[PDB]
Design a protein around this ligand. Structure first.
Ligand SMILES: [Zn+2]
Lengths: 25, 132, 217, 71, 83, 221, 56, 129, 101
RNA sequence: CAGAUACCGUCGUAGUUCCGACCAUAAACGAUGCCGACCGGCGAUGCGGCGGCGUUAUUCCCAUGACCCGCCGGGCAGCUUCCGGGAAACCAAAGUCUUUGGGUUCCGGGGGGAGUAUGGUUGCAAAGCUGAAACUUAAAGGAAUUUGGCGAAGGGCACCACC
RNA sequence: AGGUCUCGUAGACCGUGCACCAUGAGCACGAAUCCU
C-alpha cells in the first residue's frame, strides 16, 4: 500500500470520528 | 563452413616462413614438400596445410603480408629506406617566410640573412571552422 | 646547455629549422606552453621560440650522454611518421627501438621474454603515446618527450617543443639529437661536417616511394 | 559543534537539552509513564499468587509450546 | 636522529627532492633520480661530472616537473641566463 | 632449490653487491622477487595468520566458493608487511598470501616520548591512516605502557617492534581486511611526515644499478 | 605431462562432497583418450561409508 | 563577509602549501599576521616574506619552502592559563618534540615555550607544526 | 540512485516550463522533457515520382515537401522505436546519430 | 472479462475562464540552507565595457548596427583529470577534516505504532501548525559485482520449434 | 566541324497502435592448515 491511499482512509476515518464526536457529546 | 583452425594456419605460417625457395604454386609439388619437411600424423590435415600454403603463395605473389618475415623480401625495406639522393630538399635557394617570423629572426642573433624572402600578411583570420 | 660559447647554432641549424617548418604549431594551446611560445600571429598558428628548443635538445643530449651504457635508452614510436628514424637513431647510437604496437607488458610483466627496464625512456608524442608513460610510471623511469603545443604534459621531465606533424621536421630533429649525442660522446668532431645525409631519417608515403622509384634509377 | 562564539552557551545548553530529550533511553529514564508501565514498579523482584497455568506456543522457526503461569 | 649520547637512531635518512622539498615514500616508484652530464670548458665533450636531480611523484603525475628541472638547472648554471 | 633471477636487481643481489635493503628503500626500487627479502631477512622473519574468510559467487549450477587469507609478516625490529591472496583451496591461498606479503614490506621509524634516552619505544609522532571507512590513529606513549588497541592491530604492532602506542578507531572495525589495510596505511605513513630531525639537504649517492651496470652488462647480454 | 586425482564419498560430515586435484594436461574426447589415458577406479572401505578413487 | 583575518590568511597559505606553490598573495595586511610570520621566521619554518603597503589593506608576499605542514587558527579566542596549557598541547600538538602553539599575551605575541619561560599566559591565536 | 546529471530534460535555472501534449497519445508532457522530431518528407515516395513526372502538365515541376513537427512522450518514443536505451558508460553522448544517406 | 461499478469508445452535472472574499498544501527536488576566503585546465554561451586586421548599410572620412580576433566582471551551464573527498554512485564542490575550531539559523537518533489520540490554535467548510504514550519487532534501509526472470531491446540458432 | 559532356551509382528511412493473459501448501543447507 502506498502512502496516498492510507492518508485518504485516515481522512475518511477522521471525518467519521469527528461526526461521531459532534453527535456523541 | 570451411574455415581453417589455428593449428593448420600456424603450421603453414612457420613452414612458409622457414622454407620459401623450395616451394611453388602447384598444389602437388608443395604437398610433397609438406611430406618431406614435416612429420604429419594425418592426411586430411596434410591436404589442409598444402592448400593453405598454396593460398599463402598466391597472397605473397601480389604483395607482402604481415605474418611472415621471409629473407627474399627482407633487406628490400633496408635498401628502400637506406638510399641517399643528391638534393636534400632542405638546402634550397628559396625559403618562404612570414613577417612575424622575420621579427623573430631579427631578435634571436641575426639581423638579416641573404636567403630570406618575405610574404605579405593575410587580410582576414577566418581560420576556425564554423561549429556554433 | 648553452653556458659555453661553443654550444650554440652557427648559421645552418636555424636554416634547417626554417626549411623543415618547425616554427609552425597547432592552433590550440596548453596551459604549460606559454613560456615556450613567443606570441600568436595571424591565421591562428602559434609561433614558437628556437633558443628554448635548442636548450631542450642540449638538456636531452646531456641526459642521454649522462649514462654510460648505450643499450639502456629505449626509444619508442607507435605512429608511422617517425618509425624509421627511431631505427636509424638506434643504429647510430646503439639504443633499443620499439616501432609500432607497444604491447602493455614490457616494463611491468616479469615472465615475458620482452622484459626491459632501462635508465632512459624516449618517446615521440605524449598525445598519441599516452600508453607507455602510464606503464613506465610504476618503474623509476625518466621521460624524454617531443611535445607539441596541443600535447598534454603528464609524466614528463624534459619537454622539447617541436612540430611533430610533418615527417621532415621530426626526422631532422632526431638527426640533430643523434648528432649532439655523438658530439658529447666524442665519436665525431665538433667543427668538422660529418653530415652523411639528413635524408636518412625522413619517412614518406608509398605513393611517393613509387614516384621516386619511377623518376630515379 | 556548530555555534563557535565566545558568549553563546545558553543556546548550546538549550540545543543539547532538547536534543537530549530527543533520545530513547533518556526518554524512558526521565518520565513517569515508563516507570509506571513497569509492573514491578522499579523493583528487582516481586511476590505474587498463581491463578491458572497457561501453555503458550513458540515462534515459527522453532516449533514448541512453553509452559507458563499466570501470576 | 641523534640522542643525548650522539648516535643516529634511524637506519637511514630518506632523500628529499631538490625542487619539491617534500619527502618521498618507500613505495613511491614515480619518484626518480634523474642524472645529467657536465661538459668540458673548451672542447665540448663529456668528462665525468654529474648533477643528480630528484623530483616527487605528485608533481610528475601533475606534469609540471619539467619547469622545476629547468629552474634547478638554471640555479645550477646549466641553462643560459638569457633563454 | 637454486635461484635464477629474472630481474637485473635480482641478479645484482645474487652477485652480493647489495649490503642491505636500506639503499633499496632509499632509492625506492620496485621489489618484485620474493626471494631477495628471504635472502636478506632470514631467521628473524616469522608470521601468523589473521583470518580465513569464505567468499562465494553464485553461478548457473550452485554456488562457487573461493577462499581469501590475510597474513601479516614482520621482523621484530623494523620491516613489516601485509599480504592478501584469494584462491579456491586454502594451501595456495596461504602460500600466495605469505609470498605477496613478502613482496610488500615497508620500513618504519621509532621515536621517543619527551626525553631521549636509550633506544626508542613508540612512534615518533601522531600518524593517521584511512581506507574504506576505518579511521586508525597512532599516538605516541610513554615507556613501559605497552601496545593498547583492538587485539589484531595490537598484535600487528607487536610484529612492528613498537613497544608502546595509543590507538583510537572509528567505524566498522569488524571488517578485518579493511581494518588491517587501514592500520597498515597508518604504520606505512611514518616516513611521509616531515619532522625537524631531517631538514638538512640530503647528499646524493650513486644508484646501485648505476654503480654495477657495467658488471651487469658484462654478466648478461 | 599431466595427472589428476578425484575422490568422493562421506568426508567430515553427513553430506557427500567430492574433491578433485588437477595438474597438467589431460584429454577427454576422441580416439587419443584410449592409448594415452589409463583410468583406475577403486572402492575404499572406511568406517562411516565407502569412498572412491579416480586416477587418470 | 570577512570576519577573522588571521583565519583567512592561514587558510590561504595552508592551501598554497598543500598544493605546492612558492609565492603566496595574502589579501589583508593586519599586524597580527606580521607578528605571526615573524614568529614563523625566527622559528625557522618559512623563509623571507614581503609586505606591500598602500593607503588601504595591502598585500603580503611570502616565499615558501617545503618545511611547513599545517598552520591553523583556533576560533573563537579562548582564554588559556599557564596551568591549562599542557592539556592544549596534549589534545592539539602532534608531538612533544616539536610543534609550537602561539598565543597573545600582555608582553607581546610569542610561542608557548617563551610563555612558560617568562611565566605569563593569555588568549590563544593559533598553531603550526 | 541518480541516473543522469540532468533529469531527462533541459531545465537548469528555470523551475517551470509550459507543457505540451503528445501526437500518438494525448499525454501532457513538458516541452524540455519531451522528445521532438522534425523529419522532412515527400508527398509521394520514390516509386510514384515518375508517375508524377511524365503524367503531368508542366515539365521540370518541383514537387512540394511535407514539413511536420512531431512531439512524443518517452513511453511512446521507446515503444514506437524512436529512441533506444544504451549502456551506462555510453549514455554520455549528446551527438545525433550519423546520417549516411 | 469468469467477474470490470477498471484499460477503451459516446454523452455528460460541478469544475476548467474573469472579478471579489477565503485555506496555505506538493517529487514547492540541485531530494544539496546564507555570507565570505583559497586551490587546475579547455571550448562555446548571455549582458555591459575595452583594444585591434579586414567585409557589409555599394567604393572618401567619423563613430555606429552586423561580423572576425582577444580581454575584463556578473550569471545559466558543458568536457577531461591520481588536487582533494566519500560506503559508493559521484562532486571543481558534496574540496580545503584525527593535520578535526571562519560567522550564523533550522533539524535526526534502529523499524512500526504515527504524523496517531488528547491539549492548544486558525477557518464558512475542507483542513493547516504544534504534538505523545502503552505495546510489538532484529531487523528496517543506501551503493555496487556476479546466475536468475522479464507480455524490454539488439545479433543469431534448433524439424526434440514453425511455415 | 564533331552529334548520348565526364567520373562510381544503398536508386530501400510507407505508417501508427496490436485480443484476453490470474494463482503456487512448507517442512529440504554444510564453511577449514602444514611437514618429515
Ligand atoms: Zn505518446
Amino acid at each position: 500500500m502506498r502512502a496516498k491511499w492510507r492518508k485518504k482512509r485516515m481522512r475518511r476515518l477522521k471525518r467519521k470520528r469527528r461526526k461521531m464526536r459532534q453527535r456523541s457529546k | 563452413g570451411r574455415v581453417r583452425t589455428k593449428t593448420v594456419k600456424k603450421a603453414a605460417r612457420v613452414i612458409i616462413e622457414k622454407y620459401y625457395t623450395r616451394l611453388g604454386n602447384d598444389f602437388h609439388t608443395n604437398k610433397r614438400v609438406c611430406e618431406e619437411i614435416a612429420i604429419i600424423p594425418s592426411k586430411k590435415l596434410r591436404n589442409k596445410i598444402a592448400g593453405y600454403v598454396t593460398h599463402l603463395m598466391k597472397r605473397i605473389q601480389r604483395g607482402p603480408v604481415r605474418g611472415i618475415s621471409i629473407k627474399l623480401q627482407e633487406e628490400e625495406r633496408e635498401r628502400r629506406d637506406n638510399y641517399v639522393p643528391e638534393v636534400s630538399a632542405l638546402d634550397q635557394e628559396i625559403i618562404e617566410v612570414d613577417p612575424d617570423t622575420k621579427e623573430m629572426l631579427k631578435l634571436l642573433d641575426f639581423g638579416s640573412l641573404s636567403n630570406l624572402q618575405v610574404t605579405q600578411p593575410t587580410v582576414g583570420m577566418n581560420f576556425k571552422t564554423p561549429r556554433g | 646547455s648553452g653556458a659555453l660559447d661553443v654550444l650554440q647554432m652557427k648559421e645552418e641549424d636555424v636554416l634547417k629549422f626554417l626549411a623543415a617548418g618547425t616554427h609552425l604549431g597547432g592552433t590550440n594551446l596548453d596551459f604549460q606552453m606559454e613560456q615556450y611560445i613567443y606570441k600568436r600571429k595571424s591565421d591562428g598558428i602559434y609561433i614558437i621560440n628556437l633558443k628554448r628548443t635548442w636548450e631542450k635538445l642540449l638538456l636531452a643530449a646531456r641526459a642521454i650522454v649522462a649514462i654510460e651504457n648505450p643499450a639502456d635508452v629505449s626509444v619508442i614510436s607507435s605512429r608511422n611518421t617517425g618509425q624509421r628514424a627511431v631505427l636509424k637513431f638506434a643504429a647510430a647510437t646503439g639504443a633499443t627501438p620499439i616501432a609500432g604496437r607497444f604491447t602493455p607488458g614490457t616494463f611491468t610483466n616479469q615472465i615475458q621474454t620482452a622484459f626491459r627496464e632501462p635508465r632512459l625512456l624516449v618517446v615521440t608524442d605524449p598525445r598519441a603515446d599516452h600508453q607507455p608513460l602510464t606503464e613506465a610510471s610504476y618503474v623509476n623511469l625518466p621521460t624524454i618527450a617531443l611535445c607539441n603545443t596541443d600535447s598534454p604534459l603528464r609524466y614528463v621531465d624534459i619537454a622539447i617543443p617541436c612540430n611533430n606533424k610533418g615527417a621532415h621536421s621530426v626526422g631532422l630533429m632526431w638527426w640533430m639529437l643523434a648528432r649532439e649525442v655523438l658530439r658529447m660522446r666524442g665519436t665525431i668532431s665538433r667543427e668538422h661536417p660529418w653530415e652523411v645525409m639528413p635524408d636518412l631519417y625522413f619517412y614518406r608515403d608509398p605513393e611517393e616511394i613509387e614516384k621516386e622509384e619511377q623518376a630515379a634509377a | 559543534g556548530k555555534c563557535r562564539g565566545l558568549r553563546t552557551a545558553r543556546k548550546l545548553r538549550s540545543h543539547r537539552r532538547d536534543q537530549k530529550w530527543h533520545d530513547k533511553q533518556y526518554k524512558k529514564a526521565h518520565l513517569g509513564t515508563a516507570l509506571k508501565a513497569n509492573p514491578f514498579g522499579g523493583a528487582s523482584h516481586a511476590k505474587g499468587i498463581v491463578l491458572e497455568k497457561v501453555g503458550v506456543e513458540a515462534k515459527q522457526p522453532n516449533s514448541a509450546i512453553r509452559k507458563c503461569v499466570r501470576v | 636522529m641523534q640522542n643525548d649520547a650522539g648516535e643516529f637512531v634511524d637506519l637511514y635518512v630518506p632523500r628529499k627532492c631538490s625542487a619539491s622539498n617534500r619527502i618521498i615514500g618507500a613505495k613511491d616508484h614515480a619518484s626518480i633520480q634523474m642524472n645529467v652530464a657536465e661538459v668540458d670548458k673548451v672542447t665540448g665533450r663529456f668528462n665525468g661530472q654529474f648533477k643528480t636531480y630528484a623530483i616527487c611523484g605528485a608533481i610528475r603525475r601533475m606534469g609540471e616537473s619539467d619547469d622545476s628541472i629547468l629552474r634547478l638547472a638554471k640555479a645550477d648554471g646549466i641553462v643560459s641566463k638569457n633563454f | 632449490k637454486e635461484w635464477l633471477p629474472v630481474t637485473k636487481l635480482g641478479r645484482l643481489v645474487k652477485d652480493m653487491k647489495i649490503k642491505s635493503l636500506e639503499e633499496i628503500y632509499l632509492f625506492s626500487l620496485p621489489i618484485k622477487e620474493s626471494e631477495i627479502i628471504d635472502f636478506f631477512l632470514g631467521a628473524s622473519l616469522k608470521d601468523e595468520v589473521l583470518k580465513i574468510m569464505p567468499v562465494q559467487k553464485q553461478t548457473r549450477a550452485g554456488q562457487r566458493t573461493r577462499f581469501k587469507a590475510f597474513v601479516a609478516i614482520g621482523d621484530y625490529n623494523g620491516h613489516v608487511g601485509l599480504g592478501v591472496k584469494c584462491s579456491k583451496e586454502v594451501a595456495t591461498a596461504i602460500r600466495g598470501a605469505i609470498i605477496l606479503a613478502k613482496l610488500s614490506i615497508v620500513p618504519v621509524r621509532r621515536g621517543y616520548w619527551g626525553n631521549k634516552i636509550g633506544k626508542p619505544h613508540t612512534v615518533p609522532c601522531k600518524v593517521t591512516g584511512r581506507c574504506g571507512s576505518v579511521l586508525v590513529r597512532l599516538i605516541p606513549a610513554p615507556r613501559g605502557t605497552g601496545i593498547v588497541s583492538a587485539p589484531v592491530p595490537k598484535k600487528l604492532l607487536m610484529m612492528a617492534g613498537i613497544d608502546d602506542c595509543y590507538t583510537s578507531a572509528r567505524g566498522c572495525t569488524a571488517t578485518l581486511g579493511n581494518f588491517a589495510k587501514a592500520t597498515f596505511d597508518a604504520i606505512s605513513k611514518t616516513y611521509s611526515y616531515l619532522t625537524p630531525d631531517l631538514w638538512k639537504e640530503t647528499v646524493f649517492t650513486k644508484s646501485p644499478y648505476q654503480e654495477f651496470t657495467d658488471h651487469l652488462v658484462k654478466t648478461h647480454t | 605431462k599431466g595427472c589428476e586425482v578425484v575422490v568422493s564419498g562421506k568426508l567430515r560430515g553427513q553430506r557427500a562432497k567430492s574433491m578433485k586435484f588437477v595438474d597438467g594436461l589431460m584429454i577427454h574426447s576422441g580416439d587419443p583418450v584410449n592409448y594415452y589415458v589409463d583410468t583406475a577406479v577403486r572402492h575404499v572401505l572406511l568406517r562411516q561409508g565407502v569412498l572412491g578413487i579416480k586416477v587418470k | 563577509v570577512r570576519m577573522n583575518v588571521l583565519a583567512d590568511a592561514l587558510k590561504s597559505i595552508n592551501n598554497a602549501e598543500k598544493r605546492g606553490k612558492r609565492q603566496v598573495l595574502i589579501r589583508p595586511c593586519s599586524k597580527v599576521i606580521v607578528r605571526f610570520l615573524t614568529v614563523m621566521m625566527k622559528h625557522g619554518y618559512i623563509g623571507e616574506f614581503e609586505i606591500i603597503d598602500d593607503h588601504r589593506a595591502g598585500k603580503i608576499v611570502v616565499n615558501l619552502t617545503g618545511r611547513l605542514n599545517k598552520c591553523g587558527v583556533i576560533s573563537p579566542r579562548f582564554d588559556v592559563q599557564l596551568k591549562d596549557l599542557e592539556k592544549w598541547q596534549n589534545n592539539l600538538l602532534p608531538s612533544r618534540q616539536f610543534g609550537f602553539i602561539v598565543l597573545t599575551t600582555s608582553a607581546g605575541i610569542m610561542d608557548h615555550e617563551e610563555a612558560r619561560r617568562k611565566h605569563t599566559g593569555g588568549k590563544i591565536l593559533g598553531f603550526f607544526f | 540512485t541518480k541516473k543522469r546529471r540532468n533529469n531527462g530534460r533541459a531545465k537548469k535555472g528555470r523551475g517551470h516550463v509550459q507543457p505540451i501534449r503528445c501526437t500518438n497519445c494525448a499525454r501532457c508532457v513538458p516541452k524540455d522533457k519531451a522528445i521532438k522530431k522534425f523529419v522532412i518528407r515527400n508527398i509521394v515516395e520514390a516509386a510514384a515520382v515518375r508517375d508524377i513526372s511524365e503524367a503531368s502538365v508542366f515539365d521540370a515541376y518541383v514537387l512540394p515537401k511535407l514539413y511536420v513537427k512531431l512531439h512524443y512522450c518517452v513511453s511512446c518514443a521507446i515503444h514506437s522505436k524512436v529512441v533506444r536505451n544504451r549502456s551506462r558508460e555510453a549514455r554520455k553522448d549528446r551527438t545525433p546519430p550519423p546520417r549516411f544517406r
